[PDB]
Amino acid sequence: ESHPVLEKLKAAHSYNPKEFEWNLKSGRVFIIKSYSEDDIHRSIKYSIWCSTEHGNKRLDSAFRCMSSKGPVYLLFSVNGSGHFCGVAEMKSPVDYGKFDVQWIFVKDVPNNQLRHIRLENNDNKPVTNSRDTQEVPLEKAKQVLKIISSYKHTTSIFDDFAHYEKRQAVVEVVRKERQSRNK
């Protein structure tokens, strides 16, 4: 049994494209650390993301600087998870906060596949030990994207899609009822 929201998304978008250009001619690449799976699920279904105030300012500045001269890619991981869960392209500046994204890869890549890549601009720490909106230098970003694109993943957040749908629905009714008790 597959969920109609997920079937619509898969039919409208070409997730995990088998031809993806990891050897970028230009572009900038950033880490996104999400607070929960629920935020990832919402972002995939609505093509939207929101960082902190400072994170939003950093990403806004990077997107405007790129001036349509190359892509801004975002590599997503939930705090404490032990894997990356996907890759989206930033598609608009920040609107005050939120900005448009286009999800491209939706797949789990364990950290042990990526920890050998270290970021010279962050004390040579592994890319898997990054904070939200940490920037990845272009050549290391190429190696990360090559690994993510190629990885033969066994699972992804889509495998729990119906679960996240039901969670969202129940949260809404609970909040509405709570407001109802407060008027």
Q: Do the beta carbons of residue 3 and residue 10 sit within 8 Å?
A: no
Residue with tokens 């190429």: 142
Annotated binding site for RNA: 33-35, 39, 49-50, 79
Structure tokens at 114: 């990526």
CA distance readout (Å), 113 to 36, 97, 126, 135, 155: 22, 33, 11, 19, 15
* Resolution of this deposited model, Å: 2.1
- The DSSP element (H or E) to which 124 belongs, if any, is none
- How big is the chain by its Cα radius of gyration, in Å? 17
- The DSSP element (H or E) to which 102 belongs, if any, is strand 99-110
- Domain segments of the chain as ranges: 20-152
Annotated binding site: 33-35, 39, 49-50, 79
